[PDB]
Write a protein that binds this ligand. Structure first.
Ligand SMILES: [Mg+2]
Ligand SMILES: [Mg+2]
Ligand SMILES: [Mg+2]
Ligand SMILES: [Mg+2]
Ligand SMILES: [Mg+2]
Ligand SMILES: [Mg+2]
Ligand SMILES: [Mg+2]
Ligand SMILES: [Mg+2]
Ligand SMILES: [Mg+2]
Ligand SMILES: [Mg+2]
Ligand SMILES: [Mg+2]
Ligand SMILES: [Mg+2]
Ligand SMILES: [Mg+2]
Ligand SMILES: [Mg+2]
Ligand SMILES: [Mg+2]
Ligand SMILES: [Mg+2]
Ligand SMILES: [Mg+2]
Ligand SMILES: [Mg+2]
Ligand SMILES: [Mg+2]
Ligand SMILES: [Mg+2]
Ligand SMILES: [Mg+2]
Ligand SMILES: [Mg+2]
Ligand SMILES: [Mg+2]
Ligand SMILES: [Mg+2]
Ligand SMILES: [Mg+2]
Ligand SMILES: [Mg+2]
Ligand SMILES: [Mg+2]
Ligand SMILES: [Mg+2]
Ligand SMILES: [Mg+2]
Ligand SMILES: [Mg+2]
Ligand SMILES: [Mg+2]
Ligand SMILES: [Mg+2]
Ligand SMILES: [Mg+2]
Ligand SMILES: [Zn+2]
Lengths: 191, 172, 143, 52, 137
RNA sequence: GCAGUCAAGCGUUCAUAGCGACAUUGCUUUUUGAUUCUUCGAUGUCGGCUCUUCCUAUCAUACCGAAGCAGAAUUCGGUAA
RNA sequence: AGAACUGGCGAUGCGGGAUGAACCGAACGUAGAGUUAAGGUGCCGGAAUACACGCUCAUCAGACACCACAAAAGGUGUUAGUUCAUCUAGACAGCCGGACGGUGGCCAUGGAAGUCGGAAUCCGCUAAGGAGUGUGUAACAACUCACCGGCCGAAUGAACUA
């Protein structure tokens, strides 16, 4: 019906600065800095204090108002990600052919290489994305762990790796093999 | 049916020796001129009482000017209308300065949304919602808050000449 | 049904405001379900405790401003999580049954009602010494 | 072979889905509508069938 | 930096006592006050001092000035005049590059031929003394 | 000729994996009819041969989603001429 | 294919429907000036990229009588609306506290105390707390939820209409 004012809040935790101009956002906290282009949305920011900023949509129709909240979340995950930061854990599921997962590199690349997937003489390679770092758990078997400031980039990499192991021409209810995401929390604040 | 005027129409049955002085009947009628008003008075009368104009006469026709035509009001509007497949009753509210103002957006609003031309719409009752918070339709409650203020983002000044020696700004 | 059980409460709230002369507003922030059960036993003799939802009480009280009207100044006290202890036993004994016993790691008074007046439960916890040296320093002022 | 909790983990991706009865889209298990626009977002869903 | 930086667009708001410049019609070019808000596209304005009649007006044929004075919502014509006066709104209007240019524009359009001639001359006169300045440093 | 909607039944169990009765909405113009507008100062017809291009309601091939998909095989569907 | 009344085409140009016998407008000597009809006014194209309130976003939009087609059936797209129910005696959502006594209830048996399971579903104290919604234990524990409340302050749910 066109809601004349509708707005949302973004708490700025102690230790971060978020600066915003022509809807180009930059979040700077402990873990470093992220930026994001929010040009594609008409919303207007306003700072009340160094701990609070508001996002508002004036005279917006429904789907306009929808975009509001998502702006808050996106910016939020910038903040937390640069304070707490994100970390995705996965697991190797395979019922007979052990999945061999190692890091390689050509041209200072860093890829995720996946060998022996269900017996495949092929080798799979998933680019390791910038500012997402790859580790391997020491007690937890067949684990893999992906961490960094940016969910988007950390999530997606985890998803690129799951998606490269997708099982073709078999009944995927029987043949469950793959690298699936098992946990998603922060780097800090316990596990 | 356009720029609206509101009319009182007072009419009656033609007198019979048996019934000299028949009862007088009144309607408030919204039409643009008085001919359509009078014509509307019959349309409705014919549906309520057993009467056509060939057997009745119209006694009076007087315009009802808005009492306080610069006070902003919240209006209750009850309506009966014909869709393509049914006929329906319908309440909606309109914030404006006069009844005559309100009815016109009512008549447009019915076309915009339910595609209802003037012909297919009966105006049941219209009324100034006295106590705010008797307003129920949000899209008017929205304007009732204390110190209501809002901007008008993305100004678009129309141009007088077709070429412009500067890239326009939309800044209000 | 869901109105009956309210006017029911309304009834049995009113009944106490008439029968008992004195009233305890007791805060029960936190405080387990088991605690209150044993404040019932411990007080079963005289007092009765009566717990309720605030908006039901502010309203019922105001709805009783015809008769028993100086229950009106009771209302700036029925905020937060509070409740009612009614009694005809003397002040301190009950308040001390209330404050002290069944305390662990105990529900506490927040304001008291007495014949149209209001104690802070501070003026209740008296010292009698202040009541001794005020009749003494006035006989010393006289002398 | 393959421990219960991973068989489980794998099924979250492979078998706890619902399916559009019209276009066969693999849909989230609690879906109320299909997301594909070709079946006009129908609510005619069914659960992805479980193995033996 | 180490502050959070957020420039927020600082629009002229439509708010009781927002004072507006009328764009089209019999009350064109005149100032009025916004007295009450009808809806997202329509307000109530009154322009007592300048002779513009308390009316419902479509927001489109008005342009918000940056001025604002104190006014109770929906105030009859009279107290607008009282309030507007009190606040010295005309006085603040006149002082603006906006209000001044309009004056210039009308002045220019009022010139006789003979007056246009005279401008030309004096402008020549000023020119000469400028060009030299534009060459001594 | 081709495709739907409803869902009683088939389907060990289970309407809808794959089907689908009573009914019902449609589409097509390579069927056959109905029509008789055009051409009777006329110029054959069928089939094949040869060759090009177009349609898609897809048989194969590419990538997929389903299954009463363990594997193999198949089957239903999507993007696709 | 075939009748009724009338108006047409045929016999008839003109303006509009791009086009076109039959629609709409209007019927015609040779011309000037004005005004209009039906139809139009972004550009082709004469004429406001006029004013006003809504509506709509289509990886197959839609765009004007005759007319150059679309239907049943569907859509948590989005708009307005209806009925029923909840709610200022404070709901809904969200955060927060309590989640107790008979009592490890009866069977059963290595053990099963609310949560393998058969069988019942009672009471007390309550503002409220199931002879238990799940997690969990060898069995207890511990945690959860229903249920009541603290805060908040005006809306909420369900079915439909076009
Ligand atoms: Mg990315
Ligand atoms: Mg398959
Ligand atoms: Mg196979
Ligand atoms: Mg510029
Ligand atoms: Mg998942
Ligand atoms: Mg600005
Ligand atoms: Mg059967
Ligand atoms: Mg089945
Ligand atoms: Mg013939
Ligand atoms: Mg023939
Ligand atoms: Mg010939
Ligand atoms: Mg196709
Ligand atoms: Mg089966
Ligand atoms: Mg087989
Ligand atoms: Mg085989
Ligand atoms: Mg086979
Ligand atoms: Mg089929
Ligand atoms: Mg081809
Ligand atoms: Mg003719
Ligand atoms: Mg002839
Ligand atoms: Mg003719
Ligand atoms: Mg045409
Ligand atoms: Mg052209
Ligand atoms: Mg032109
Ligand atoms: Mg334009
Ligand atoms: Mg029609
Ligand atoms: Mg709809
Ligand atoms: Mg909690
Ligand atoms: Mg809780
Ligand atoms: Mg157990
Ligand atoms: Mg327990
Ligand atoms: Mg209400
Ligand atoms: Mg309806
Ligand atoms: Zn679908």
């Amino acid at each position: 019906m066109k809601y004349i004012q509708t707005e949302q809040q973004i708490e700025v935790p102690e230790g971060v600065t978020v600066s915003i101009k022509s809807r180009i956002v930059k979040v700077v906290g402990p873990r470093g800095t992220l930026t994001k282009n929010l040009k594609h949305i008409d919303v207007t920011f306003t700072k009340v204090n160094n701990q609070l900023i508001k996002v508002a949509v004036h005279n917006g129709g429904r789907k306009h108002v929808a975009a509001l909240r998502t702006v808050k979340s996106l910016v939020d995950n910038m903040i937390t990600g640069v304070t707490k930061g994100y970390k995705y854990k996965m697991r190797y599921v395979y019922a007979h052919f052990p999945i061999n997962v190692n890091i390689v590199e050509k041209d200072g690349a860093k890829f995720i290489e996946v060998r022996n997937f269900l017996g495949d003489k092929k080798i799979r390679n998933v680019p390791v994305r910038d500012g997402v770092t790859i580790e391997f758990s020491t007690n937890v078997k067949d684990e893999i762990v992906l961490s960094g400031n940016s969910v988007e980039d950390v999530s997606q990499n985890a998803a690129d790796l799951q998606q490269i192991c997708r099982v073709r021409n078999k009944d995927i209810r029987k043949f469950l093999d793959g690298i699936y995401v098992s946990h998603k929390g922060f780097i800090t604040e316990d596990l | 049916m356009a720029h609206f005027k509101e009319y009182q129409v007072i009419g009656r049955r033609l007198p019979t020796e048996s019934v000299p002085e028949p009862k007088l009947f009144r309607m408030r009628i919204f039409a643009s001129n008085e001919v359509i008003a009078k014509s509307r008075y019959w349309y409705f009368l014919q549906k309520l009482h057993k009467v056509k104009k060939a057997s009745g006469e119209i006694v009076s026709i007087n315009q009802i000017n808005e009492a306080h035509p610069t006070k902003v009001k919240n209006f209750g509007v009850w309506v009966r209308y014909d869709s393509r497949s049914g006929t329906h009753n319908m309440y909606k509210e309109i914030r404006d300065v006069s009844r005559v103002a309100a009815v016109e957006t009512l008549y447009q609003d019915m076309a915009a949304r339910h595609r209802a031309r003037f012909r297919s719409i009966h105006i049941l009752k219209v009324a100034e919602i006295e106590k705010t918070a008797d307003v129920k339709r949000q899209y008017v409650k929205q304007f009732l808050t204390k110190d209501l203020k809002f901007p008008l983002p993305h100004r678009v000044q129309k141009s007088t000449k077709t070429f412009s020696y500067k890239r326009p700004s939309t800044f209000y | 049904g869901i109105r009956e059980k309210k006017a029911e409460y309304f009834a049995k709230l009113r009944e106490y405001l008439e029968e008992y002369k004195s009233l305890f507003v007791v805060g029960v922030d936190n405080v387990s379900s088991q605690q209150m059960h044993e404040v019932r036993k411990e007080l079963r003799g005289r007092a009765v405790v009566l717990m309720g939802k605030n908006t039901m009480v502010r309203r019922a009280i105001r709805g009783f401003l015809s008769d028993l009207p100086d229950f009106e100044k009771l209302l700036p006290f029925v905020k937060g999580n509070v409740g009612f202890v009614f009694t005809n036993e003397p002040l301190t004994e009950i308040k001390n049954v209330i404050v002290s016993n069944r305390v662990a790691a105990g529900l506490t008074v927040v304001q008291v009602y007495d014949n149209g007046q209001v104690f802070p439960s501070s003026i209740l916890d008296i010292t009698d010494e202040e009541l001794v040296s005020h009749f003494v320093s006035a006989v010393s002022t006289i002398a | 072979i393959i421990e219960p909790s991973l068989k489980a983990l794998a099924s979250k991706y492979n078998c706890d889905k619902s399916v559009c009865r019209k276009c066969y889209a693999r849909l989230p298990p609690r879906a109320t509508n299909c997301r594909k626009r070709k079946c006009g977002h129908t609510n005619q869903l069914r659960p992805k069938k479980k193995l033996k | 930096s180490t502050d959070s930086i957020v420039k927020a667009s600082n629009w002229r708001l439509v708010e009781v006592g927002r004072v507006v410049l009328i764009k089209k019609g019999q009350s064109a070019g005149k100032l009025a006050a916004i007295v009450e808000i009808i809806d997202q596209k329509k307000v109530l304005i009154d322009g007592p001092k300048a002779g513009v009649p308390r009316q419902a007006i479509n927001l489109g044929q008005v342009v918000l000035t940056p001025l604002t004075f104190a006014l109770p919502r929906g105030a009859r014509t009279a107290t607008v005049s009282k309030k507007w006066a009190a606040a010295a709104v005309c006085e603040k209007w006149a002082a603006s590059s906006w209000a001044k240019k309009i004056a210039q524009r009308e002045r220019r359009a009022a010139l006789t031929d003979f007056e246009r001639f005279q401008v030309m001359v004096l402008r020549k006169q000023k020119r000469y003394t400028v060009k030299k300045a534009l060459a001594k440093a």
